[model samples]
Target chain A: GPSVFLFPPKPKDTLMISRTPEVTCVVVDVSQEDPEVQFNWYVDGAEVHHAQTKPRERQFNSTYRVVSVLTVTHQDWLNGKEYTCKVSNKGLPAPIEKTISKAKGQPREPQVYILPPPQEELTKNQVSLTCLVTGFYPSDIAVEWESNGQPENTYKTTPPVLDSDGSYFLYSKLTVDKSRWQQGNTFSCSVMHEALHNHYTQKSLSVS
Target chain B: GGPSVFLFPPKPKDTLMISRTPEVTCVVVDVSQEDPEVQFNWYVDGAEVHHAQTKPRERQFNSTYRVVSVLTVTHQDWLNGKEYTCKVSNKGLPAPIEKTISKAKGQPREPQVYILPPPQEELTKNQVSLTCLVTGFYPSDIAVEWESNGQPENTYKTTPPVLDSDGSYFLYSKLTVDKSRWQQGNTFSCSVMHEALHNHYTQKSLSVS
Candidate 1:
């Protein structure tokens, strides 16, 4: 154990998460040896009664790092709460603190594609019309199907599937009766998402 | 219609890097209730920004809802790298959730892009195929496009971005076109955009004999 001394923690401490157990970890680092340090945790300006703190672990040479984690419930995190980690010691009259919060991301507009039914399906009594809503960010989307300008419920929708870029894509299918298709009833797919603003995208198809 | 399953709010990944302006967005997802009562607010460098555009909450697949908000700042604040924070609150929430952002750009490593010409031996009689490979890029946001004779193609398909062994990212895009068109010595090209390229593109072209 070396003599007691202190250096302010490096700026920009990080907040990391562990998905399996739903934990938020506060990482505090300092460049000192045997610098007796203590931690206090707070959530949204209120003191956390019980936050687990790990013993300070020395780095390969000089710097030392410690992690203080708060076991949070899933709902609590979703509420958009903030967390702060307060680090202090006798060498300093005041404690140094770092706060972290989550932020919403940049939005990417959705792409609407109305895929016609396959040739084999066109020969059947009913054909399936696929409305593919893809390349959208923040995942929440609303999709609707209409026939001849009237809302129709003859459809099934799949949950949003994450795309390569962390955006999302979804599929909804509308079943049309053969007579309805022969009558040339106009079918439309309308989509709503955060990136679309007040104007949603609509794609319509009709076959006479 | 199904057994009980947990619907925890999913963790948010880094924001999409598609903007060239000073507009910022904040979002909260999967709130258990659906209503217009949810409140979203913003603060920049400790001063409140009252004009943030908070959108209406929309229901999700799980019967829950989410809200999105945007705030625009002057060029001076953006260039100064001032800190900004967003807070989300609702009657049903036990506590307000918040997130913050600052000026930080991670390392930029360019992707090594290549176009694998269609193999002569495996070429389809009527249509031919080409592959575009983009690998070893960091900060993964990227765009891949295919073209022939300066006209973009709609038949091209791109695979999901893959994480490489060394903390980089990789992607592959394939394009199929009429074989007769290629026999005309059409110039087929692949263009890629990445953060490392700084909005410009890395392009490669080839023509079959």
Candidate 2:
């Protein structure tokens, strides 16, 4: 009997691609028992023949699993480039196409600073920790606060502010509880940006 | 009592002296005129400087009128860096005349540049934003510019220089770039022009690493 549908019960609408500085991989999966199922790969727009397909047969359940992969070299993803994978199966009326494009611009390393709380705040037995992250671009970032080496919350973050010079400024604040501040507990702010190898910055609070 | 006296009162106010080193001295704000009603008042940072000794004298000048007032400032007055103003009031004029000077001289200093978001974060943002902080400078009229690679850039902006309590200036300039075509591998610089700078300009660079 003809399989009611493709071997895999579900198909992904968009293909997933893993990238590296040297190479990248584009993968597409489909489930079908028919040998005539076809796979084609296009880069930028031209069809290329450097793709591989792996099909496995399951005898106990009487189903087939097929995975197609395309390899992209360093030169391929450089600059602006697009990759697409098209799949045609007898179980479907039309072909399924998924495309992947890289976003423009590289990430900027953030400049992180821990600014001391204002004078009035110190007199109240409360100290504010300001994480001033500046000189970054593309605008995506994450900031984390910690107290005494443990994850801590209760902080406020400002949206990215674009400067006239095209860079961004991000400010995050964490107020120390009066008890915690009096106890001299250490506080820190960690920043995450994609451009850095470690991709993180940690600044400790120094109360005099 | 002769022709209404408009003769330039002794221009001693033009010789105001400012000293940086801590000292104890009397600063004089002198005013003269044919009217005996002329009065003198001394102020610091807009507030009246109290405990000042004032002396009034009258002398014959060209048969018109002449008056002189002396103000003796105390040691505590100069220690606090504030603008000292000498205001003169006389019946000869509709408004009082005033002259002001800050006791502290401009020190004339350079600036420092801090490029942010470690190198990795810099790469992620695709562009780097740099902050140029100019402090300890005097005269408050310094110029700051961004240099992409080697050429100077005009796309940047600098805030108005502000005066600190110590009579010095502090300012900030910001430069943002994904890298100008001229920029190759991260060589942005912040250059400062100041009258106090001698021989070479103050420059700090973000090197390509």
- Highest TM-score among the candidates is held by which one? 1
Q: Predict model 2's lDDT versus the native.
A: 0.53
Give per-residue CA lDDT, model 1, range B82-143, as digits (tens).
77777766665565666677644467687777666554333654665566666668756677
DockQ, per model, reads: 0.02, 0.02
Q: Please list the Cα RMSD from the true structure of every candidate, rounded to 1 decimal place.
A: 24.0, 26.9
TM-score of chain B of each: 0.71, 0.41
Model 2 Cα lDDT, one tens digit per residue, B1-209: 22122212111122222232222223222333544465556566788765444445444544434444444554345434556666556656565556666544545454322332223334555554455555556655456677865887877755555554345555555565664432456676777765445532567666554
Q: Candidate 2, which segments miss by more than 4 Å at Cα?
A: A1-102, A125-127, B1-209
I-RMSD for candidate 2: 8.7
Candidate 2 residue-wise lDDT, A1-208, digit = tens:
3222212110011111233231122222334554445557677788887755565434445455445556555335434367666665665566666665545677566678766554345675554556667767546567788887778776655556666646676666576767886666668888765556556668775555
The TM-scores of all predictions, comma-separated, are 0.41, 0.32
Tell me how candidate 1 scores on lDDT: 0.61
Interface RMSD of each: 13.6, 8.7
Which residue segments of model 1 deviate by more than 4 Å? A1-208, B1-25, B29-36, B44-51, B59-65, B71-84, B101-105
lDDT of 1 by residue, A21-136 (tens): 22334333465643656667677888775656677776786656665556664345434377666766544556666665444667677767665554445676766666666567
Candidate 2: CAPRI quality band: incorrect
